């Protein structure tokens, strides 16, 4: 899925 709050540079979620 898209990241968002995580950021394009943030760690990835399933």
């Amino acid at each position, epitope marked *: 899925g898209p990241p968002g709050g995580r950021g394009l540079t943030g760690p*990835i979620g399933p």
Partner: antibody
Amino acid sequence: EVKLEESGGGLVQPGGSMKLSCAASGFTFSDAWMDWVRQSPEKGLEWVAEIRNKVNNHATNYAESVKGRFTISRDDSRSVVYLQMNNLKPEDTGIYYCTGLTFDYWGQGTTLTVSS
Amino acid sequence: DIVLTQSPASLAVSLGQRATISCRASESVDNYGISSMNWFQQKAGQPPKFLIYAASKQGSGVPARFSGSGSGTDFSLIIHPVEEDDTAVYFCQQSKGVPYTFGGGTKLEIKR
């Protein structure tokens, strides 16, 4: 246009305290994961602390070198990140950048000097 | 701590030439079929600017001449054709494992 402004840097003596804060506009703050990074000549660029969004329980994480000395926190209503820094050491000297969306966005930085 | 070592420390590249800057991670940084590796440019007196994410993807408005590539251990940033504004320090940065870690930096000088 996205903007992050740090304040609350300056001079303070070892063991003392200082509260840095960070004003953020231009992105949906409540959703954003925020962080503090610091830069000094000796150590380079050091990620200091993270704080995740409301969906992720505002989870904090820190560099082991500042655990239980620094505390990161936020006000999703004010769109503001805070770094409470306690028992400050000479190695904590550096420029502190506040970043948004992990490290997508970066403020201009506020300088902290920890010297007697 | 997954430690990044960049090479070289600095180079000096003529205009319209290739500038290749490499990053070496002490453990793999791939997560969920995506390589967790980013690149930053720091121009003098300024904060680091985000350039590349997911090893090979492009930041918004980030010029075509910047592009990254790699997988697992070894990544690189490729600037070509180089221009006068590309004089900066370049960091690679890892985002799989906490702590999130920055390389020590690589200085690009532009030859004239």
